[model samples]
Target: KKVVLSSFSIIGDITQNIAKDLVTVTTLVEAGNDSHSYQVTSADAIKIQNADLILCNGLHLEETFMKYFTNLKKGTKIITVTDGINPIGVSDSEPNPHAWMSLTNAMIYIENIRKALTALDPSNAKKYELNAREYSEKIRNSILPLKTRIEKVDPEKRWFVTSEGCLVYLAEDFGFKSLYLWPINRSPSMMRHAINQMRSHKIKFIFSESTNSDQPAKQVAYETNASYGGVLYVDSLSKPDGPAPTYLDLLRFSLTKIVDTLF
Candidate 1:
């Protein structure tokens, strides 16, 4: 079987779901690990060298591993799953690389994965196409109820505040106003400013990601008299034994938590 490599666990989950039984899929970063600062091991280097195809989330999300990927041996095909999607920016100069936050955007990623896999192994093209269609349909079905849940929240309480601005795609798709402590991580002043902003907006719930420090979000909630919603899974999924072991589970877990907290 051809070996496929993914930059991180979330991407791995998507690839494995689509390439099931047809290819061997491996991930460079494990569950609950930060993709921004992942230390690629020698084994990862060997995996990249041996991979028939490599999948990544592009837009600088994997800066730590980009140099290695850029210098890969010849004959290895690299696919950026976010290739066709117009990215949202953290700032005017920097694009947010968390496109998978939106299930709608994730369908595009699945299509890109299917196309890449088919190109790599044309014999399995039909299988890949069938798998991609089935997975995409499952995702579509999952997202409808989540959207309905979110829509049930009172319009006056439709803010989805979190520690990082990682949910821009999700907020756009679900029609929630996003407020965050910082564009990416926590800083004292920015946390204070974010707290002030949430307070001004009468925001009632605040959240942090599983990979982020919940302290800042707790501080914001305490100072603003809002509830600390819960930890969300983004940038990375949880361990297999934890809440979000798969990409779809990550979305379901986070959305359920958000609806339960805000409503």
Candidate 2:
């Protein structure tokens, strides 16, 4: 069996959906695990060392700890999902690494996955291409429903408040404005300003991310009298048997939660 190594669960889920029964895949970070602070264990190192191929989202999104894996092998065949997509420059210190927010951009990821799989196992190229095409079509179909779901709110209420600056692509796609509670990490000043905006907009509800701390969000909700609608999973996937075990499901789950609560 072919072993495919992915940097994290989000990529792992996408890879699994495409690779299917062709490859044995192992993810670096497990479900509900945080990649930002993930340290490479001896077990993780073994997985990478033995894998036939390694897949990563690239763009330094893995933080310092997980990045060490890539640095370990100079000639390692790593496929970066953000390869061709034009990423928005968030700051000199960091670029927005969450490229999966846009369906069109995600198509790029599928293409890269197909390419990697084909390169690793040329005999399965036709099957990998077929699966990638099918997945892309499904992703395209899901866009309309997602758009319709998000469009329910008045354009004036299209403002999103979140813990991280990962929603630039989502905001761009849906024509919504987003305010990051913190520039890099959560900050008190940023939280206070976001709450002030919530008060000014009279926003009754704001969503938090499941992967982040809700303390700041809870404080904002209390201060503005705005209820915490729910959370979205960013940069990682849920548990294997959870509602958002896959990347597509994660987006659908997040959009559904936002629409159900916001509207």
Candidate 3:
């Protein structure tokens, strides 16, 4: 009884954390791939075709081609973990899909994963619950220092600048504000605007995430003469060898990078 995990990337990592021993998890996207623009390739299509159950973050986070999953040949189950989690709507559009940033919401995600795994493989119900609980507790313990790290930083210097608006949930959770990059193409205008903002605001650091290239952030830092802080992993967890190899490591990596940069 194998299960196929079809989440964007970050949640895919979370799914792997809980179901690694119990089920085989296959991710469609590789590390640093943006769900916002990730298109399905022939390889990904085949992965979905062979999957027994498809686990997605849902809430339309996979902006590329999730509808393809729904229109698949019948009998394959698609479970939306974001369901019943009380999602929040995005400012410019509908609810934001980057819910994994919040530890509490991630706990809900683990629970949903446990339920789905239990239902799919009834024989593994107790084991799944036990693993989920352990992972959830670990996640809780991991994020506590994240809160403390942010607390040590100057309140006014806590703002972040990134290409994607994915940090909204994390910012709200940690009491930080974030600025956007190019609203359209990664044009010079966006870079100029971010640089000007950084200059005027006396922004201490310019940062992006592991899932994004630091080209834009570098431009902002070069122009503003501010330090290019570092990359924070949000949308995707680390690869097997990266510093943020585990989900817990991912949180610690992000916090350490930010705190080290700003303070």
Candidate 4:
């Protein structure tokens, strides 16, 4: 089996879904962890050397650990799964790396992964293609229906404030306002920005991504007299026993959280 390496758990899980038993998939950043500040280790170098291909989200989601990926030995290849994505910006320069938060973007990631895996091991290309199509349909059935459900509601009423701007792509697909305290993590200044948006739009529900503490969002929720819609998954998936154990589950779980709270 080919050894495949993924930047983080969400992409890791997606890789596994496509590669299946054909490849030995290893995740650099594991589940329920923050990928923003994940540092690479000597063990990772050895894994990278052994891997036939490396997969990453590549809008700088790996942050500190990405430099090591660019400089690698021969026969070991890497691909930026967000290759064709048009990202939402945090600033004039920085593009948001959480494109996987949107199911449509996730299908793109699946195609990128399928192509990468096929190129690395073309003998198994047909298997990879079938897997990709099956996985895409699973995603389409799971995600598009929710889009329909939320589409009925006025886009203006689809307001939700969150701590991270990770959901910008999701908000774009689902027609909700992407309100946040910070672009990436729990940071300063944006709280006031978020509060003003929440107050002005009458957005009564606020949320935080799973990797960050809910304290800041709760504080804003209290100050605005808004409800905390619970933690939304973007950075990575949860444990095998948790609500969002898979990528499709993460989308469904989050959309349900947003819908149940707002409506």
Candidate 5:
């Protein structure tokens, strides 16, 4: 079996969606791990060498994992799944690493994965194409209902407030104006100023990531008198049987939870 190693759980699932049993897909950063700061080790280096291809969500999301690229076997190729999506800017040159949160961007990442896998294993290219076609259609279909729901709501109520800036792509695609804390909320005086910004924007709902502390968003919700719309998945997927077991589930589940509660 051709082995493929993905940088994290979400992309691994996406690769698996296309590769199916043709490729033995594995992830370096397991579900619930910190993809942003995950430290790749000697064992991962061995896995990198063992795999015929490596997939990662570039933009420094998993830089430590990519460092292994420099030392991998000569023929092994590492592909960044987020190759063509435009990203929200950060203080540094690196774009926001959470582009997969956007279902539109997720389709692009899926396309990139399908193209790379087809190049690696040509005989099964037809199967890869079919898989990518059906899977991306499923994602597009999932977003359609959400778009309809979002459109029915007052457009002015589309402001999305959150603790982290991870949801811009998702928000942009899903028709929400994302206002976040963190880098945008860089100071003690500034954090409250962000709260004031939230209050002025009339932000009625707020959220924090599933893996992050809920307190920060809860705090903002309290101050802004906005309801805490509950935790949404960011970098990681939940273990099987959890709310966000699959990338498809996470996207729909999180967006469903938000539109259901936020409005």
Candidate 6:
């Protein structure tokens, strides 16, 4: 069996979803862990050395762990899933790494995975293409309901407040103006600025990410009289028994919570 090494749980799920029955997929980072600062371990090094193919999110999302992949076995192929898509620029130098949050962008990721797997093992090309098509359709269908729900909200009230600004793609796709405490990480001044913006806009609900602290979000809610919407699954998926066990589950849970809290 071909061994496919994925950078994180979300990428692993996507790889498994496309690869299915054809290859054994292993994730470098564990579930419920942040991918941005993941430290490579000895076990991860072994996985890279043994892997037939390695999949990464790219755009510097796996900054800390990428060096290990560079020294992998000579024949191991590394593919960046977000290779072709135009990323949302956060700054002149930094682009948002959470492109998978958008359904259309996720379709691109799936297509990229299909291409990588097909190239790695051409014998199973048909299976990879079929699986990618089916999974893409499922994602599209799942997002339809979310679009419908989001459309029901008044345009003026469609403001999304969160601790981290990871949902730029989602907010752009769903027509919500995203407000956040900080761009990628947390800062006291940015948090205060976001809270002020929310108060000025009369945003009554706010959200936080599962990977970061919700304390500041709670404080924003308290000071602004806005309710803390809930924790969103972004950088990582939850454990098997948790609300978001898969990539698709992560999107569904987050979008459902957003709609429920808003309307």
Clashes of each: 0, 0, 0, 0, 0, 0
Q: Rank the candidates by lDDT, best first.
A: 6, 1, 4, 5, 2, 3
| TM-scores vs. true structure, each candidate | 0.96, 0.90, 0.84, 0.95, 0.93, 0.96
Report clash pairs, candidate 4.
none
Estimate the TM-score for candidate 2. Answer: 0.90
lDDT of 2 by residue, 31-74 (tens): 76766677788888888877778888866677665555654444
lDDT of each: 0.86, 0.77, 0.73, 0.84, 0.81, 0.86
Over 182-205, each residue of candidate 1 has an lDDT whose tens digit, in order, gives 776446777777878887889999
Query: Cα RMSD (Å) per model?
Result: 1.3, 2.3, 2.9, 1.5, 2.0, 1.3
Can you tell me which runs of candidate 2 are displaced by over 4 Å? Answer: 70-75, 183-185
- Residues 57-103, candidate 3, lDDT per residue (tens digit)? 87677656777676564677888987776655654457767777666
Off by over 4 Å in 6: none
| Winner by TM-score between candidate 4 and candidate 1 | 1
lDDT of 6 by residue, 1-263 (tens): 88999989999999999999799999999897788667888887888888999999997788877778877777888899998878777646688788898877889999999999999999999999899999998888987798787889988898878888888888887777888887775567887888788888899988889888898889899999999888898889899999999999998888888888888
On a 0 to 100 scale, what is the lDDT of residue 222 in model 1?
95
> Candidate 4, which ten residues in sequence have the lowest lDDT sum?
184-193
lDDT per residue for candidate 4 within 1-263, as digits (tens), equals 78999988888889889988899999888886778777778997888777788898888787778778765657787799998889788867888887998877888999999999999999999999999999999999988887777777766787757888878888886666778888875456678888877888888788887888899989999988888888887778889998899888998888888777766
